[PDB]
Amino acid sequence: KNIDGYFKIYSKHTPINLVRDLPQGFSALEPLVDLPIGINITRFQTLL
Amino acid sequence: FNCYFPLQSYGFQPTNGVGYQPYRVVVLSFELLHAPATVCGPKKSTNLV
Amino acid sequence: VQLVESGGGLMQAGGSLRLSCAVSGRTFSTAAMGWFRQAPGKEREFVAAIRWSGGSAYYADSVKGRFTISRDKAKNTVYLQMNSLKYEDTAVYYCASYQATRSLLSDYATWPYDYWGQGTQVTVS
Ligand SMILES: *[C@@H]1O[C@H](CO)[C@@H](O)[C@H](O)[C@H]1NC(C)=O
């Protein structure tokens, strides 16, 4: 998310046993990065 | 005639007058935009009691 | 900068000869190259100067209309084409670089320069 000029990145790694969709269950994401960019963002894409 | 190069060299010799001696100059300008402020001072701490 | 002259030698009056002077190091875009000559027992005398950017040329009266100075930027070389050789033109010619960006090209006739080549002998018969 991109709020108040800060780019915040939260994440969580979990083990799973499921090949179709998102596992059902619950886990919280701890913050990883807070970037003070002040950059307007409106679009994004993924890189594989 | 009436067509000159805009620049000219400085004469910096060790024996030159202080008025004509070379001086290194740095001008620091401070900017507050619609962005996070990312250049801050040291903000010194103290001991804990 | 390092200056290396070439092209001197013996020529008959009326002939033509091309001197070369390769410029290396800090070849400034807003500098100039000049050719000067010193005859035995005489003081060094300005001959011709050319500004590196644009190639406008300035000549001493003693050589105006006879000699041409040119430079090849890509090769960082200045050339002196010595046409209509005369007895008085006999001298050692040295190529020098003007690190002083002078607005008025004619000022390079009297400016004391910074670095000097080794010299090449020209003898006019
Ligand atoms: C971001 O976009 C809004 C409107 O699209 C604009 O008012 C604002 O100046 C922009 N901010 C930056 C830092 O480009």
How far, in Å, are C5, C9, C10 from residue C120 at the CA level? Answer: 6, 8, 11
Q: Which residue, among C2, C7, C3, has the nearest Cα to C121 in the 3D structure?
A: C7
Supply C123's token pair.
């003898």
Contact exists between C and A (3 or more beta carbon pairs < 8 Å): no
> Which chain B residues contact residue A6 at CB under 8 A?
36
Residue nearest to atom 5 of ligand 1 (CA): A40
Which residues is C93 bridged to in the sheet?
C37, C120
Question: Total domain count for chain C?
Answer: 1
C35 touches C19 (CB < 8 A): yes
Q: Which residue, among A36, C30, C74, has the nearest Cα to B37 in the 3D structure?
A: A36
C16 touches C82 (CB < 8 A): yes
Give the CB-side neighbour count of residue C40, counting CA atoms within 13 A.
4
Q: In angstroms, rounded to a whole number, what is the distance separating the alpha carbons of residues A46 and B29?
A: 38
Residue nearest to atom 2 of ligand 1 (CA): A40
CB contact under 8 A, C103 and B7: yes
**CATH code of the domain containing C81:** 2.60.40.10
Q: Which domain holds residue C51?
A: 2-124
Question: What is the residue whose two structure tokens read 């960006």?
Answer: C101
Contacts of C112 (CB under 8 A, 6+ apart): none
**Minimal-distance CA residue of chain A relative to B37:** A36
Distance C13 CA to ligand 1 centre (A): 77
Q: In angstroms, rounded to a whole number, what is the distance separating the alpha carbons of residues A2 and A39?
A: 8
**Chains sharing 3 or more CB pairs under 8 A with chain C:** B
Residue type (1 letter), B20: Y
Q: In angstroms, rounded to a whole number, what is the distance separating the alpha carbons of residues B35 and A37?
A: 7
Q: In angstroms, rounded to a whole number, what is the distance separating the alpha carbons of residues C117 and C2?
A: 7
β pairing state of C57-59 and C120-124: unpaired
Instruction: Please classify residue C46 by burial: count the beta carbons closer than 10 Å to its beta carbon, then call 0-12 exposed, 13-18 middle and 19+ buried.
Output: buried
Q: Which residue, among C20, C18, C19, C47, has the nearest Cα to C34 in the 3D structure?
A: C47
How far, in Å, are B18, C52, C70, C108, C110 from residue B4 at the CA level? Answer: 29, 15, 20, 14, 18
Entry resolution (Å)? 3.1
